[PDB]
């Protein structure tokens with residue numbers, strides 16, 4: 001499935017070049033701009049442990065998820081990954097634990113040492 005394909009073929013979008021955040025574009029977006037550090041970004045998403053059968057469904061699918069890019073308001077992989085996305089893009093991200101919740105996890109949904117997988121749709125972004 002998509003997690004396997006991303007591990008094998010996905011682009012390494014990390015500074016370390018550790019294949020810790022891997023990306024495949026699912027739907028090509030608009031233009032060439034990407035959000036910048038500090039911009040408010042607006043997304044839809046689906047996330048799971050990478051070996052889970054189903055995406056987590058514990059958030060409202062209609063209401064945009066909003067955060068300030070690059071400010072440590074979300075896991076490291078999202079700050080790196082959303083920064084690479086064009087408006088209207090849908091992307092797959094496969095994420096090693098050190099770019100997510102690491103050895104601590106976040107129990108009960110996220111165990112220690114968990115690899116995560118997301119589908120993210122970038123709806124919009126705007127600067128200060």
Ligand SMILES: COc1ccc(CC[C@H]2OC(=O)[C@@H]3CCCCN3C(=O)[C@@H](C3CCCCC3)NC(=O)C(C)(C)N(C)C(=O)COc3cccc2c3)cc1OC
Pocket residue numbers: 045047048049056058059065072073074075076078100101109110116
């Ligand atoms: C700077 O580092 C952090 C900053 C903030 C947090 C709190 C959790 C944070 O969640 C996330 O960053 C990711 C990506 C954005 C969507 C939510 N995230 C989740 O990990 C998912 C998770 C994915 C794997 C399957 C289980 C669900 N979390 C959620 O979807 C739910 C709804 C379960 N969750 C509690 C929230 O989305 C809570 O709202 C948040 C709002 C901002 C940041 C975080 C969570 C954790 C951090 O590091 C571990």
